[PDB]
Amino acid sequence: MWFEVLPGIAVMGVCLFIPGMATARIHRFSNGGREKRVAHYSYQWYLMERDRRVSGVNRYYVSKGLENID
């Protein structure tokens, strides 16, 4: 009956689920287990480039805390 249409809906729904799950996991893989930095404005990009310079390893997502000062 009407549950015969549910396999196609399941296949299409898994295919719609894949891109968002993929970009979430790829953003966490490419950015140190965290969200991708959102730089819409030049202050956010300024702090991000500051992070890339203060990390020492040319990666903004490598965070440096109190241990990096004396």
Partner: peptide
């Protein structure tokens, strides 16, 4: 990889 995991499931859906 992120671009393909966008656009190939678009074609499948």
């Amino acid at each position: 990889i992120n671009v393909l995991t966008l656009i190939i499931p678009i074609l499948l859906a």
